[PDB]
Amino acid sequence: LSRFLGPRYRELARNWIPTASMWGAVGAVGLVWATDWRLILDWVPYINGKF
Amino acid sequence: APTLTARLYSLLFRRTSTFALTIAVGALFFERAFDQGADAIYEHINQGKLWKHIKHKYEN
Amino acid sequence: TATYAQALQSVPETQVSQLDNGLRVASEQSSQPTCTVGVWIDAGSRYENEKNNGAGYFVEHLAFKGTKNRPGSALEKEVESMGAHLNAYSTREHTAYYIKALSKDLPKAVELLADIVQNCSLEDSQIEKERDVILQELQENDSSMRDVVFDYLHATAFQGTPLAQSVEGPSENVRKLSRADLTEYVSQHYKAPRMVLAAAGGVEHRQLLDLAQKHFSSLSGTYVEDAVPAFTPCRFTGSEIRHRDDALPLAHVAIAVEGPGWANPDNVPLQVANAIIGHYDSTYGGGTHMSSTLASVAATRKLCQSFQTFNICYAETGLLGAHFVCDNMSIDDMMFFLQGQWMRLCTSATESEVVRGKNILRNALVSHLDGTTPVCEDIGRSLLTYGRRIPLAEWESRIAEVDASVVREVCSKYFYDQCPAVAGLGPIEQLPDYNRIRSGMFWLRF
Amino acid sequence: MTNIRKSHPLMKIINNAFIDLPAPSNISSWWNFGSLLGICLILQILTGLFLAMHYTSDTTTAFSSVTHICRDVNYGWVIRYLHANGASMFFICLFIHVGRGLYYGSYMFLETWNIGVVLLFTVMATAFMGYVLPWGQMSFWGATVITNLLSAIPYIGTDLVEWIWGGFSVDKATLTRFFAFHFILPFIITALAAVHLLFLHETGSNNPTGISSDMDKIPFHPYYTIKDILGALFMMLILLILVLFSPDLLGDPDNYTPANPLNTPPHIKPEWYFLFAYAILRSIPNKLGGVLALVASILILILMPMLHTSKQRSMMFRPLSQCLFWMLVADLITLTWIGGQPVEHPFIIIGQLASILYFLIILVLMPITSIIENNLLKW
Amino acid sequence: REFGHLTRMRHVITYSLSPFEQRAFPHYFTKGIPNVLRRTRACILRVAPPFVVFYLVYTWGTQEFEKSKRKNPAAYEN
Amino acid sequence: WLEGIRKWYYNAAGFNKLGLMRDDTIYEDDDVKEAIRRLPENLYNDRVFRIKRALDLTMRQQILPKEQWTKYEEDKFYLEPYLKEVIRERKEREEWAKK
């Protein structure tokens, strides 16, 4: 662990953080859509036309 | 003067993450739109027969 | 206790003056007793059409073979008698003739250069002799694998463009060339506005300018019948050319992407990025411990005999990539690692490697510009390309501006999701198909 | 010419896998339990296929089908009890196998160990679903409680539970689903076993000493083949003793009364193999905590390689670690006993203490003791 | 990991007699029994004590549970 | 005091009984493998023979005669300097990687 607690690793982390956030957004949308989770979709415009 | 397609590439298609997010959102909206449109088409083709088209007569 | 900044400030400054005909006379003065004076001409294969391609190489071959004022032996005798070394180099974009000589021999050197540039005999018997020599030299150049793979890279990358043509030219053109074509080439491309007289070392700029006014003044920039050659931007075509010759011992592969022009500011960050990628040969002592990840892995697994990264820049386009020689069964692995390094620089470059690349670039810049010959070459090429000799202080400032963010930006612009141009020679069966190579140019994670 | 065993592709694979595989000479009888697991899996697959030739999965006919197998089918009782007791033998050998891996530090083969944990989960699921198939009182109610455990999961919860149930409660849909899954899972186990063997062959086999045995390797065909056959004969001895002499020793008698959804059996307990996890679950009062504890009981094997702080792979030369390991084994025996016994005053505290001690031994005590051992050996 | 190139070993000489010219069970009892006793002596110090604790807990647990089921006379007294 | 309990552990651990030495029983991770390949040939051959003899003894479930057991004082940590150097070099490489 102490090996990765270094400034260069922090730099790499900052570099990949937006990508990780985007992948998280992809995962969230995927989950909501696949399950048709109504709790989230209710707010989504013109997807609320269903249910 | 970038075209529409070049704009789409440089905005969403360049990095796979934004590509996947676009695919997911498009998937959701396309699912909704296609479902609505195809259902409309099928209903129109079968207009006058479907129970939803005639339930009002027997309901209430 | 001079510092690097102070040393850059103390560098002698190039003084550029222009003769009325358009010849630009440039000089950097040093205390050295030896000087290198040369004429750089903005003529090359990129300015040649199909039928006259290779005429520049022919003219270069026979330029030292005699003048109207002094016959063929006379020029060589004068040059050797004063102890000078006369040499010429022809590239796709530039042609140069430079004389290494003592400072006291500057006037005679300038006379000889003017005679070579202007009053070239182009005698027919010498033309036939040089024709035979050039055909033999083409046959010899077939052996040099690196030159062949780079010529293939230019052919496939800039197909349908004049840049694709080789400097030497096809053998058919060589045998079909005539005295009229060589004379026409000299008349069309050797013009005073397109020439630069550069000197380095113990040269006084006033004396050099006066000698230029004495000798080069007659040369004119007027084009006969107003037939003015017009520069043409060259299209970069992503393509793959594979000369599969399994008999060859090792496989040479050169892969490149379109790069900036000479004057584009993005050259400096790209040079820093290439320095980060680095260069490796089997004879390097550093081996596994070398900082370059590609070099370290290549040394550990003996993937490649040699690999180097090149940044070839032309006026409006350039070839940015690397050339690696490897075994038949290690090509795919080396390509994978090279593309991985490219994508790593594009996506997740770090400050430390950027500092290393900047330092390497600074050392290369300062070390290369050492001696009268490289300094004069830099002066001439900088005047022809940049229109100005960029001082080392300006180079240092531009390097210092480079940061990890800059490197990531420029590498993403030039290297990421861009169709590459690949040339392979030898046992290149394991070289991945172009679809796989293009797929490697982007990361599904990013 | 070439040797057909080496040259032919399928024969090449079989040869490298079993015939001329380099194996350490010193591996003891504990290493035979892997081949015993393989034999148990094959025997279970054949036995269950022959049972399925006479088993109908409808709730109306399931118990009657098992009675038909036991009585009318020629030698059907032999097959049915071979299956029932082979499940127990499978779990005995699995527990001994994982114990060998823990004791001799075989978990350092990371991918093999993880595939083994996956296999353990699959085998446990297979057995749990299979026990429902006779559709006895105990089968129905154990299924009810074990599936109702899933309701503790927040949010999805009841939705997931009813999806597995196929309805509001355990019923015909659940029985048929469990039959189909119980059929298909052993084949996935057979494929994961091939993956497991591949990963192990990448690194060879560990020895009881825990020191690399490349210097001393012997061909598997001339030695461990006859050793594994002897182990299989001993396993058949024990299993056939169970099947013939004491056919209903490891089974609860209340599985012979047809399942009645309106009446709870006098005691609801899982089979003996699940009893330790049942006790661990019962120890924690909160439902979600109990489910998470039950999952962690098995998943700690995943964390076992990371918790290895000793400089010696095997415990053969780690006496204090040996003492801790046997304490853990006794703790597992205690957890089994508690799970068998009802939830009353004496057993509740014993179960809580046993669960805490199990987790403590695996997580804290063993690494600290290993560090102390390293300090003792002047490391 | 083929048999040829597993590891590097030097100057080790091994003599092995055939199965047919040697007895299958040399001193199975004369030497086996003392060896087993030696193995048991070393192992029993470590394996046994943890299980001994379980027997105590099993006995105590069974006794305590039976005691709890037995009636408390004081409850029905008075 | 401490040497008493350390000597106890040395006897408690059986690697002396098999004729092994402490460094023979270390787990062969990458650092240990590099240390082994850095051993002088005499030390290496001694190591491999010791381990082979120990494996043979464990195969037949026998132990070396009492007089031939390794002594706690006579045990020599042959691999310790090489392994320490390997660990130090790895630490330096990690440190350079950190920043």
Ligand code: HEM
């Ligand atoms: C159906 C289930 C399984 C089968 C068929 C199976 C089969 C085998 C076989 C044949 C071996 C060869 C060595 C030996 O037999 O001792 C082996 C080794 C091994 N297995 Fe599995 N096993 C199973 C379950 C597991 C589980 C549940 C684990 C861990 C939780 C596991 C981890 C290992 C390990 C660590 C080894 C290394 C043995 C050594 O170091 O020599 N296996 N297994």
Ligand code: HEM
């Ligand atoms: C390979 C690992 C397997 C295990 C651990 C396993 C375990 C079990 C168990 C515990 C039972 C309940 C026995 C009882 O209480 O009566 C059972 C029943 C059954 N198993 Fe399996 N089984 C396995 C493989 C198979 C396979 C491959 C089939 C294929 C059809 C199968 C078919 C059956 C059937 C039909 C029953 C119901 C008949 C009966 O309960 O006697 N089993 N199994």
